[PDB]
Design a protein around this nucleic acid. Structure first.
Ligand SMILES: Nc1ccn([C@H]2C[C@H](O)[C@@H](COP(=O)(O)NP(=O)(O)OP(=O)(O)O)O2)c(=O)n1
Ligand SMILES: [Mg+2]
Ligand SMILES: [Mg+2]
Length: 430
DNA sequence: ACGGTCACACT
DNA sequence: AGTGTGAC
């Protein structure tokens, strides 16, 4: 009991933008605002794939990955913003740049880890101690947490959601012992205050609304963030974990969404995260491996040690395009032209990256898929990247994958390529 | 015909 | 260096 480590050492927040691509388009185009809206790419095929959905639109059942034509059936008045197309492919520059706006603001408060284009993890442990020191035996007002939810509260002895939020928050605050600096719950609470400030700054400065989860680790922070979206932040305490995890589907936990989560469910015959507590660390390790087993054992107990990496920028800069079914490239000239298009966009992004971030990519990775292959990549190959030259990069990429072309004629390409991928990696200071 | 990107574990 | 999984 005295020696058991509860994973309450850190205060971690995950801030995730609400329907991010939609918001970027909405900010730029006021007409989209407060309306059922979605962002689509490649309009020609079935109206284009939906990649982002406004909350008004989600009410109609519109979802990501839905074809726009299908979405229209559910929501006749659905408004659509198209992903920019450059050189015959979708260009995500606007959203990347919008992401930078958010990331830079967040970086002001603490070192951040860029988990995705629209979200980043924040370790507020240092910030919290300092803030706790700044306010002395200073009780924390509810006003400082206007958008905060306390998961699991209210409990025990208004049918409006805001009323519920307030009751829960009040129960939490009344419970709090302000005087003790060490208390994890107090630390989470102060962390929540900062997140409120972080989120207000984001909205004021970009016009983008976001949600956040405050907890002692990344997994819990991420899970918490989703609980009260949109435009709200949720504090998941260590104590709330048992009840929260008791009915929490295993797939919900980050990294348990795929095969591992399925095997975990299949092998152990359980549905909920909480049920994982019944197994010894060794038991979990035997089925899912040493690293996974330890992670699962600690995680179902609300404990995770994965640190918030200090990484604001992406480690890689990549361009890729799919050429599905009939559109697969079956000629050498075709492959070369598309490689060139990818290389050109990559070059523009690489050049801007070098100026902005003082770094150069020393390695080029070329990936392709042949028709009928199961795998996302038929082949992956890498060559040195010494110049930010689109022609050289595309020329080099062709050299690397050219032998994949079986056909004797060599003016043709067989099998036709379903996918082309170019990625710049191994960045170095410059 | 569930696209375009990213990170990272395993080998 | 290459492959596969998971995420968003
Ligand atoms: N499969 C996916 C998932 C997300 N994205 C993009 C579009 C999203 O707007 C953006 C952020 O992803 P997301 O946070 O998981 N969902 P989104 O931000 O749109 O809505 P929220 O549920 O977070 O409020 O990345 C994508 O392009 N392809
Ligand atoms: Mg989001
Ligand atoms: Mg996200």
């Amino acid at each position: 009991g005295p020696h058991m480590a509860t994973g309450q050492d850190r205060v971690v927040a995950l801030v995730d933008m609400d329907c991010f691509f939609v918001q970027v388009e909405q900010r730029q185009n006021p007409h989209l605002r407060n309306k059922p809206c979605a962002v689509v790419q490649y309009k020609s095929w079935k109206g284009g794939g939906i990649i982002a959905v406004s909350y008004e639109a989600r009410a109609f059942g519109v979802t990501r990955s839905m074809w726009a034509d299908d979405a229209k059936k559910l929501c006749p008045d659905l408004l659509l913003a198209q992903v920019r197309e450059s050189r015959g492919k979708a260009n995500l520059t606007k959203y990347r740049e919008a992401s930078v706006e958010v990331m830079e603001i967040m970086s002001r408060f603490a070192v951040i880890e860029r988990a995705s284009i629209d979200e980043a993890y924040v370790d507020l442990t240092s910030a919290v101690q300092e803030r706790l020191q700044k306010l002395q035996g200073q009780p924390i007002s509810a006003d400082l947490l206007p958008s905060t939810y306390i998961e699991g509260l209210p409990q025990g002895p208004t049918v409006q959601k805001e009323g519920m939020r307030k009751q829960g928050l009040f129960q939490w605050l009344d419970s709090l012992q302000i005087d003790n600096l060490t208390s994890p719950d107090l630390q989470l609470t102060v962390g929540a205050v900062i997140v409120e400030e972080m989120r207000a700054a984001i909205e004021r400065e970009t016009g983008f609304q976001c949600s956040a989860g405050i907890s002692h680790n990344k997994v819990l922070a991420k899970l918490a963030c989703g609980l009260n979206k949109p435009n709200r932040q949720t504090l998941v305490s260590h104590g709330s974990v048992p009840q929260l995890f008791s009915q929490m589907p295993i797939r919900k936990i980050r990294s348990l969404g795929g095969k591992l989560g399925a095997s975990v469910i299949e092998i152990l015959g359980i549905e909920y995260m909480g049920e994982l507590t019944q197994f010894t660390e060794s038991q979990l390790q035997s089925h899912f491996g040493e690293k996974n087993g330890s992670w699962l054992y600690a995680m179902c107990r609300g404990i995770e040690h994965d640190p918030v990496k200090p990484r604001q920028l992406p480690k890689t800069i990549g361009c890729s395009k799919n050429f599905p079914g009939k559109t697969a490239l079956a000629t050498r000239e075709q492959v070369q032209w598309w490689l060139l298009q990818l290389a050109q966009e990559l070059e523009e992004r690489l050049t801007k990256d070098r100026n902005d971030n003082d770094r150069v990519a020393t390695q080029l990775v070329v990936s392709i898929r042949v028709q009928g292959d199961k795998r996302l990549s038929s082949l992956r190959r890498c060559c040195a990247l010494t110049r930010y030259d689109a022609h050289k990069m595309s020329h080099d990429a062709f050299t690397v994958i050219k032998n994949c072309n079986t056909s004797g004629i060599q003016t043709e390409w067989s099998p036709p390529l379903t996918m082309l991928f170019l990625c710049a990696t191994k960045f170095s200071a410059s």
